[PDB]
Amino acid sequence: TVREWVSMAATRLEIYHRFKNFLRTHVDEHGHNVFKEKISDMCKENKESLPVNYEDLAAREHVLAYFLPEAPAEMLKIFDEAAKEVVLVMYPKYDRIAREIHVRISHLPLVEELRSLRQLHLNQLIRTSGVVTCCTGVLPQLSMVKYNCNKCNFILGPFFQSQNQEVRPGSCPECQSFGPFEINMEETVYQNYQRITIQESPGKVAAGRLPRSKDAILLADLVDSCKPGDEIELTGIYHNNYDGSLNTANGFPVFATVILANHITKK
Amino acid sequence: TVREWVSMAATRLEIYHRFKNFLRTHVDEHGHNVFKEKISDMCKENKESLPVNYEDLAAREHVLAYFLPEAPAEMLKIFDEAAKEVVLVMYPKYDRIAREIHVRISHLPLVEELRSLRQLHLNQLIRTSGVVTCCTGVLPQLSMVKYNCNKCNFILGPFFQSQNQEVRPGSCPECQSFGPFEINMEETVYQNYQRITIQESPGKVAAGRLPRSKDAILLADLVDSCKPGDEIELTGIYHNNYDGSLNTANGFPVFATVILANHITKK
Amino acid sequence: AKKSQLKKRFREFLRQYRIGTDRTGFTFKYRDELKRHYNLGEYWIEVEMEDLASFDEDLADYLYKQPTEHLQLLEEAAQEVADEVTRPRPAGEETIQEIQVMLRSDANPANIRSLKSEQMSHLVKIPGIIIAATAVRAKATKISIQCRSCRNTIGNIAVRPGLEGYAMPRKCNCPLDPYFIIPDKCKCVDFQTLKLQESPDAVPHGELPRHMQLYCDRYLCDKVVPGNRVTIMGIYSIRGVGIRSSYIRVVGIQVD
Amino acid sequence: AKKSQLKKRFREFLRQYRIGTDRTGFTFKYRDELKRHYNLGEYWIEVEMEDLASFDEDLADYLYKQPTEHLQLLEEAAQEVADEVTRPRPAGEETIQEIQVMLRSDANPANIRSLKSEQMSHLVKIPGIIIAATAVRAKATKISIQCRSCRNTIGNIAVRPGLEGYAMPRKCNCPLDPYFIIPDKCKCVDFQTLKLQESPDAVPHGELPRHMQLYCDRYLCDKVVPGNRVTIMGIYSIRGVGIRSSYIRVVGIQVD
Amino acid sequence: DELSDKCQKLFLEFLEECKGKDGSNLYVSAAEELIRPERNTLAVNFTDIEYYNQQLATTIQEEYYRVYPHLCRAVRSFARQMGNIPANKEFYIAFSDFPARQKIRELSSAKIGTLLRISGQVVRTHPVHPELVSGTFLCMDCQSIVKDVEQQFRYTQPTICKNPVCANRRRFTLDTNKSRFVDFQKVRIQETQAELPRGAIPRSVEIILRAEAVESAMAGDRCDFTGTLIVVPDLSYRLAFLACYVGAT
Amino acid sequence: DELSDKCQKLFLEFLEECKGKDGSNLYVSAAEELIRPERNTLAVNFTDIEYYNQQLATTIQEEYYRVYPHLCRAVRSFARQMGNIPANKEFYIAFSDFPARQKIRELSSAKIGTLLRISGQVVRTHPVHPELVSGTFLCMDCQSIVKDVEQQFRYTQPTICKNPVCANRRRFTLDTNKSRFVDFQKVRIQETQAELPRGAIPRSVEIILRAEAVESAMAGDRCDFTGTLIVVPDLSYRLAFLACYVGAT
Ligand SMILES: [Zn+2]
Ligand SMILES: [Zn+2]
Ligand SMILES: [Zn+2]
Ligand SMILES: [Zn+2]
Ligand SMILES: [Zn+2]
């Protein structure tokens, strides 16, 4: 599995160094350093999102360009860390205006349709297109929860939360008060949340068939980048989420599917 | 590993059936059923210990006679269960005078000495000889502790305890009060405990060498079967127990060794 | 503890702040206002934020970032100062009433669409227009409980302000959960909920305006009716997987 | 609960047991004895075990196997009966004293070497010879605790009889473990520990005699001196890995 | 179950030994395509099964639903031996050319578990959803992994551990990483006008589609569905059809 | 550490290529006995090592303690290739025929880590006890198994997990089933009368015995111990001798 190989510490460090070298040393057709200008424009307008084109990444690193579409989570995390390091080197004071630099992947060679997604595409970086039909408001979501212990008043460390399950607390050093654990509102870190709904294009839908739809999740800078009735090109991680209600309804164990959005382009 | 093979459910059932058949159908040189008389004598005097000779077990079941010296724990447990079933069949009312029938192995072909025991003999049924030097009194030991839950007043199920570690509680059905767990003194089950100390024989010790000694643990019917200054033949499971005090003393990580006694014969 | 030091610093701010120059004269501003309001029957004051910064910049900086505890300490300090200024009260009014502190500042207002998730539990200043309101219900502040079996009483329990409850004890100290709230032994205050809509000009093109739920308490109730333009100063707080509703505890209103 | 029913049955046993035949006459045995002892100043009675079996076999069978709770219920029943028999007490003696119940039976005695581990928390009858004793110390029965910081008081806490303590609370309901025992607000009883040695004839050949620790309380103290042959009736209980010391809570002594 | 084992061995022999006029194995060429991804279902003609062994064909028709898993296991071994493929890759059998046409009215409780063939007009379809075939259940008291826990048209979990220590009541977490997912679709068809008897409404039924046989038949298309009849869950029970092959005439 | 790898390869080549006058491999016949149980230590003459490669012999003498584990690993592969042997079985090297005799007084901090040879009279011995060479440590927060955790003359545990999630402070349980145990003995020897200088007491030292070299030398026997010198644990430190071979003249 590519996930196991990229999970290796030495492989992780090698990928980190390769991405740092790619960011620092990538000349253009005229020799200009593209990422210097990109980071300058990003920090000049107080953004926290850095776009990366897949074509030049493949041109300068084919191994990583092959690893990415198969393990899009850890690879993107390493890319984010390397980008943050490079930005901090270039702009030492940017730790005030931002706390995490995100990497957005553009021009992914593979393009699919909402009607041809099967279990083969699970946990893979896919690229689809469609028309937005629904857009909920921006709600806050728990990013890193800081559980406390009533037995000792000491507060446990951060616990990352995913969009697929409910995070549970760990173990206190010596007084094992697993039960009496709560959440404080002044140290927990939150993040923006928005769940859009995309459907097939009016022109591209088969006459005999009916339009299909899939749910997408937008977080952090991605929120409020779409409005209902807009044609978009969505790149994200196809993700599988259990839904017992559908199981009971259909009478057969079935799971819901959602897309964790990573890059959105409006055409 | 023989332990893994004998841990299989089908293998366990086959061994159980073979031992039951051996107990029920084992004629003597004159055709007399030896185990019928043995069980009659055991139940007549209100005992809970049934001796089994290794020679006839090998004669009637070589596979089990080979399995036993390599996995003496689970094999003996299965033997105990089969013996209890046979006794209950023969004497339906013996559940009052006893609650568990023990099997004692006699005439083990292998014989060793206290000076030639190494890590090769760990977790194996060994047979040694020596002279007793110390005998502590009979103290009660926790056999099956019944932990309770303060959150619900319901008491957890039995938890077996071994002579090598301290048993910890499990998980309550819904109210996870791991901390507030205690022990009641009227539903717990105890067992007798006695720790003898055996040493090398005065005549058999090498003139240049000095006498050696090893600790043995006696439980249930075995207690008060030895007195200081007695020559005995000890059969039991050679067992390894950690001892950090010896580690600190010697300056090197070392572990203590004890023998879980199974059969004791006085010569 | 540091809480006592903070309370003492707030008391010193209330007792020692003065306005004016020696060419005309000096008048204590918040002590006189506290005395006048307490004698009139209105138990509230309006404390500016530039004044507190000028007196003690650290104290102002601890109110823009951790408003809850510091505002509670400020209210307790105001109660103590008001008690000491009118110490010989007439017969029947020996007990000292609680004082509510309202905040105000001259900062540039933010937008509803600019409220990130980082600015949680921070003082914010957002304009808007009120489009809805609810009936004035009751919110408890002090409660007393009693066991159903052994009738043991645990009085003077305090309930946190805002849309936050109180988890009742399980052990009786008499089956599980034997405690019930005594009806007559409860002190309650006014309580209202509003809906703030984004200003008609800050709304982007081709998009419907957004909304935000507000919370008003005590003397802030029945101050704004639907259809008024207001500027709200309040505490951003929280009331799908891990999704929590977010409201705004209002601590100051400036009707336009 | 079943505890109330058991207590009522014990009270009925105490109030209704009679001895004799109609050819001579009937005399209530335990009610008269309770009245006489309470008036004399000795607060104890000696209840046989065959009498309780004859009155109610189930009640006797619940005392030979779960002595702790049933003996406590029997003592409470004895206290209530003694209170009702001498109801108009003289001035100054309104409060009713606690009664201690001692047991006796005619069963064949066991041996110290015959005490298995199955017979734990069961009434046993073992003879022997006393070879040691200790000074009469004090054992608490009712204690009252108080917080070190907020001086809250939690009185009338009951401590189980025997060599068993009381785990003090952690939460103050004021740092962790803020509770200390008030010295003068403690009720104590007498307390002694003995050592019973196996009889000189029951000892096997070529082996030293074994021993067993005993526990005596209230009127059982200072009844046996070293060098006496006794027959002890008591509760087998517990005070290496998992090894626990075992003693015998003595509830009756028959000095020979 | 020696019947299932014998059927599996005979089916494997049929796959590796069937030869037409050319005297060549067609199923080896079929598995050549099964090597590639996006392919997970094989094809076979029931008439050729009869030609090779009419007795085996009859045995298949007797307990088609019961012996289908073993047929899939055999075709898995055949494809894996033919070419290098991931072991986790599942395979399915599609039975075509079934002459035993049936009637919608003819369906009854006796026919449950036997291969059939029905015709109808597609009324409505449903979107494609993942389906959990065999789930991985883990004890919360000992962390023993119990894999390949089949789901019988309902969330089903055992009460025993993989290791002989625990017997957990209801605490069995599910791991999606070790689980098996197959495409699922739920279409509805009604009785055709020709089949319609006098004075009777069409008895519409529901059809379960899996594997590559998903999004195959559009609405209002006359199709012949070949598959078994099963019961989909006092015990509430309802009838349903699980078609393995869909054909249009 | 290419030095250790090169030493391992050269030692393996020496084991599989050393040939005396008969032109035959002695170490293959030695490993024939290592196939049997109760055998876990091999023998080798340092003079023959010099004959085969004096440079390799010098390299061994430089860092004997450092390169000894790799020598053991190489002899493990040699013995396992020679005959069927359980993988868990460990093997050890005993170095004999070392001409570089030393003095007890000569021992110093500079000589630590180098192969030496000393003589003395055995004073007292100790009973045989198990010794934990490499322990298995398990995190209590994620249950990740960290095997082959060497013990450096003390109970040593790491603070990191096998998987990159936890970093446990002190919660690392030890499993004896996956652990490695070797025989351990602690004897004491004193300086011989011949070595005794004028007006000086004998400087008795302690010797660590392992493997089959246990219960080898009785009390009051003049023996020559071949082994390295190590430091056995402000940082308290004391000297000790770890003899791999014991010989009597
Ligand atoms: Zn804690
Ligand atoms: Zn519970
Ligand atoms: Zn109560
Ligand atoms: Zn307190
Ligand atoms: Zn389990």
Ligand SMILES: [Zn+2]
């Ligand atoms: Zn961990």
